[PDB]
Design a protein around this ligand. Sequence first.
Ligand SMILES: Nc1ncnc2c1ncn2[C@@H]1O[C@H](COP(=O)(O)OP(=O)(O)OP(=O)(O)O)[C@@H](O)[C@H]1O
Ligand SMILES: Nc1ncnc2c1ncn2[C@@H]1O[C@H](COP(=O)(O)OP(=O)(O)OP(=O)(O)O)[C@@H](O)[C@H]1O
Ligand SMILES: [Mg+2]
Ligand SMILES: [Mg+2]
Ligand SMILES: [Zn+2]
Lengths: 271, 271, 306, 305, 100, 43, 48
Amino acid sequence: RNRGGVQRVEGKLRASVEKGDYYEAHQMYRTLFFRYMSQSKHTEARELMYSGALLFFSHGQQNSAADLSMLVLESLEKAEVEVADELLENLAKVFSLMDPNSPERVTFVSRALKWSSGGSGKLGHPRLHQLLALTLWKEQNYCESRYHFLHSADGEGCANMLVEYSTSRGFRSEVDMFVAQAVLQFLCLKNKSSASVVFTTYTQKHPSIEDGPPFVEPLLNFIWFLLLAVDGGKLTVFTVLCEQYQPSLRRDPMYNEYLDRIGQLFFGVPP
Amino acid sequence: RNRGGVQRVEGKLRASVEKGDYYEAHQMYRTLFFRYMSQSKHTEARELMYSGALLFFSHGQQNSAADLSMLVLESLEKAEVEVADELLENLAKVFSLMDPNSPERVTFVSRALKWSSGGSGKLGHPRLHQLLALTLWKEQNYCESRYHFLHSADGEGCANMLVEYSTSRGFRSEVDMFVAQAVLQFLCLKNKSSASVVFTTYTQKHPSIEDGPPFVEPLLNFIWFLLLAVDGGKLTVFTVLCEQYQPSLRRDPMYNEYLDRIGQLFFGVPP
Amino acid sequence: EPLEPTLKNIIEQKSLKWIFVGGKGGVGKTTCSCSLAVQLAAVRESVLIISTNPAHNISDAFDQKFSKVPTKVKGYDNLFAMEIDPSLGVAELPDEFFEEDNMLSMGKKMMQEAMSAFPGIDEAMSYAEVMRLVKGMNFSVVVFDTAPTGHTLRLLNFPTIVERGLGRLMQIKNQADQLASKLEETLPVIRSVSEQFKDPEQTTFICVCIAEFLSLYETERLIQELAKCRIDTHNIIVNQLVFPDNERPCKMCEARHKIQSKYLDQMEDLYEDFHIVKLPLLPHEVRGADKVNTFSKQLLEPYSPP
Amino acid sequence: EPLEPTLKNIIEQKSLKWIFVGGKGGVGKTTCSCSLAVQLAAVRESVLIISTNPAHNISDAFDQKFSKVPTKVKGYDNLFAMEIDPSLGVAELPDEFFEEDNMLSMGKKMMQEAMSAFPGIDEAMSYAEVMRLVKGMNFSVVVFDTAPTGHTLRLLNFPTIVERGLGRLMQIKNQDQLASKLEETLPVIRSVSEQFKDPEQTTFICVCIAEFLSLYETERLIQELAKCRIDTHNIIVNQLVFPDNERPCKMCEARHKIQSKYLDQMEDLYEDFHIVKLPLLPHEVRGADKVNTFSKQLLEPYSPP
Amino acid sequence: EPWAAAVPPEWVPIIQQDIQSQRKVKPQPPLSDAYLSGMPAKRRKQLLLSEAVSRAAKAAGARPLTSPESLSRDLEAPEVQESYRQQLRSDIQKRLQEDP
Amino acid sequence: EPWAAAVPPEWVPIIQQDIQSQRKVKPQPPLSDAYLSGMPAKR
Amino acid sequence: PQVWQLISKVLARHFSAADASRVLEQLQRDYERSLSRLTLDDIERLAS
Ligand SMILES: Nc1ncnc2c1ncn2[C@@H]1O[C@H](COP(=O)(O)OP(=O)(O)OP(=O)(O)O)[C@@H](O)[C@H]1O
Ligand SMILES: Nc1ncnc2c1ncn2[C@@H]1O[C@H](COP(=O)(O)OP(=O)(O)OP(=O)(O)O)[C@@H](O)[C@H]1O
Ligand SMILES: [Mg+2]
Ligand SMILES: [Mg+2]
Ligand SMILES: [Zn+2]
């Protein structure tokens, strides 16, 4: 008896959902979630919120679905559930279903990334970043997709998306710069393997770029040699390459700054 | 576009008062006050508020009466009514009727003083100060009564109240010092004539003070000489008196700085 | 002979831009504001509702959850709704390619976090959204489901005090230049909002109250406070009235009708030069677009008991 | 089997010091809080009621105006009431008969002038008076009236945020004389904070009516209190309508069915919560006698004829 | 006399007598609360043996070898120790006649 | 050349051509906003 | 004897001889000053 209230509440929620009282169903969902979390039935509450969010998204109840997804994040955080690939997939699926211009996605993402192995930092978990980047790329949100890719670890998809983005928007004179910029940014972080794979993929696949490591474009050759040097980590080689290719690096001033970080990150440049 | 609603409200107020529904009557008083002030019937609104405050005081409705008195002050402020003895006496009576400990007395007094000769200065009109001082003296609240007298222009009643206060609470070796402090505090303010009259009356009428200005107490003789000197503004004489009577002045340390202001108030000493 | 007991004046005053609704809590500020917005949406090109109250209910009133950014109301094309943010801009995606300004970042983070629950931050962010909308201009008129009387008056007076503080700062210019430039840039919008709130043709206040002692005199105090702020207000919404049927009036209905008649006569006497529109107590929940529309219909047609 | 639908626990729990009443606007927080205070006065030695709500109504509820300083309530030997002052206590004698600390006092006066109408000033002064009372330890138990849910939550949140800010300020300070003011106020602050977090010392009464908006706003309020870890295990359902089957009109019947729906919802939702039900009285609830009569049923469970 | 010249002659004798008396008279005792209510209230003018002894030790720079808890326990407010406060009450009672 | 020693011999040849290309390369045209979107707050 | 023993007996137990004497003389001077500080109001405060 003392607990039959929850069951009656759940039954009433089912009846309301059948009737289509979507807002009332959302309120009932919130109440059930809070009660379950009171009893530490974290998994059940998370599953219920996930199912409800999917249901509301199916019916276009964007705001209610977003709120229930936020509650899913609350359940994951308060229960301190260790990161799991399936949970990342579920979160990415929910994030895909949201409205791109609705600010909640940002509010969601910042939260989700924070939960995903918060110890690492704002990077969250690279797997989730890759999933978000893939979703954005399928939605043609090239700016944010590139951002997440850079924070991701999926070099190949990043290269493919960059190729599409360049062929779409970039000018004929910028084709290399994109990848170079990306590569340089990938080295602003400690992800050198991502830089290598993305550069190789961009060079091979991009139609406007001729194949062969000895590239015609001076900038591509410079990036290739810089990758080799970072593999060798020789400061003298890095300085030689920087000095020789100064006109090319001047094509975008930001490159300079990246190099500095790279010099600190891979050649012992003083802080 | 009015339709006699105000008159009906007034009749209902009268009936409620006759029924003993004091709080509702006070509410209707506030409403009528605001309605009248909208029509600019400032005098009528003030009269109504004054009458209502007196009525509530008669019945013991303290807080309501205090609020209505505050409304009276609001009417006076808004109407910019020139200060007249009748209004000042009305305010004095209202204040006398209030409960001494209630902070509403403090608020009402502050507001009245600010209004009373608001353009004349921060001191306020002396008449209100004198009336409040008398009222407090009847209340035996000698502290505030003395303060107001000091700010007031009256010395005779001030002298009598000081005599009574010293006799009731002052110690054996403080009779002269009380009048000394009162006189010096009066003199620091420009009201020197009040200092003269209060000194004369206190000395003449105090039982423990001998007649004839040539007093036994050196300090009182010093005060007499200082009063004579300020009449001429001779700085050298002032310094002579200060230096010679230093043992007497040191009885109250504050006296020292008091003298300082005297020097610049009447002897032209630079600050 | 008296003023027409309908909000037709509000509808026809096309110059009107800002509409505030206030009064004692629970008298029906949310529902009446929603009804007024619905009525306006049939005249103005585009209207907005803002739930200034921290415990937002316009979502409940329209049975359709609204986000923190204006969103169209289901069943209407030009009617938008939103709920004020109870928090600052804490959610963002930072960059990591370079070292960040730790001092500035920590200072801003701590400031926003401490101020997140700081009282009046609800009012502060409401004012921020007011300025944002004034710049935006995107909506023809905006209605406010204001919080209870006290905080509503605090918010209404906020423009005056903030403008005066900005004037003081301009009087004490540098006696970090990016902060000075930002301060200089925001003065015109603050001045504009302060002026608009003071213009009867630009803004007006709707007082909604029930026929009871507490509600009546709370409304009276609120009206006097608005007079102090010189915010125009010339119409009141008496709500939740009861008219017992002549056939089978029961005890509770009879007594309640007596009380309401007394206080409604009081209101009629007290508030000449106000449009006192009277709304009955419906026998069904007032929620959802259809119910709200039906309820609003009589908010403009003078209701009369059968 | 369910918890008793009466506030008997509140009366019995003598360790209780601070009682908050909140909920949706117009549910009856003012009247219900006055009723609770009247009931308490019959048991505790001294009881105070504080109306933090600007445009205070407790004067209307008791039909007896109250000043900012606590005053005795007519007809009760130990019941006191007060209405918080949204303004600062700037009243004082116009000036001394000599120069003053104007060099310091002028900045404080400017700050007071600026913050007189600051939006949060009302709840700030409420917290200041709470601190003053904690210092005084004058009244055995104090009841509170708080108008909206959100600002009630802000007031409840103060202790935590103010204590954290004071701690951080101390850390920055030790990184001149005003430091004393910090150490003077940190204990008392902490003292109240723990009291607000201790279920024995404090509790929160949620009052609501049987309607959608009221019900779910109450639910949000309860969840927020749980977040602030403020104990609450009793709810007042107010303004119920029970049809007189001898003569039930249409509106009464419809309102009764709506109230029944939402009341069953509450019963299912709020197990392990006392649920005290209060009917809608025909006559107004104002004045000491009426409030006392209405409160009597707040402790003795009500039942329809 | 140096300062006698500045003052009117008639004051000089009285000033002389006042000067003589000011040395014979002892300093002014502490001010009464009554007069103490007069000046601005910014600057204003010990039964607890534990508090008194702690304050005296702190002021004089003395430190008990044992922790102060032991000292407090020794003077745990017995009648013999409260004879302290009885003696103080008697002392003030005798001094009261000097100025009731 | 002084720098030629540092780099491995096979890297040496292309560099000169690159250098020679950098000696005849025209100024970089303004960058497309798409490229501009790839930088942090400061662009 | 009088209060002086009442204080010395407890002081000498845990204080040093010099420390006990210093505390006792400081207490005596404080007592003298307090007697000087006495007023008609002090009667009520000391009576409690
Ligand atoms: N005319 C009406 N007929 C029937 N029910 C009504 C009517 N007006 C309001 N109500 C209901 O009364 C309750 C209180 O009204 P509402 O919530 O709209 O008030 P409010 O002023 O927005 O409230 P609060 O100040 O607490 O935010 C709600 O259930 C609302 O549905
Ligand atoms: N049981 C009741 N029967 C009849 N009238 C009631 C009852 N409870 C409250 N009322 C009346 O309902 C109105 C609203 O109640 P009240 O003013 O106490 O609410 P509140 O919680 O203080 O609201 P606010 O949010 O405005 O402060 C008042 O007139 C009150 O007298
Ligand atoms: Mg509302
Ligand atoms: Mg209330
Ligand atoms: Zn009925």
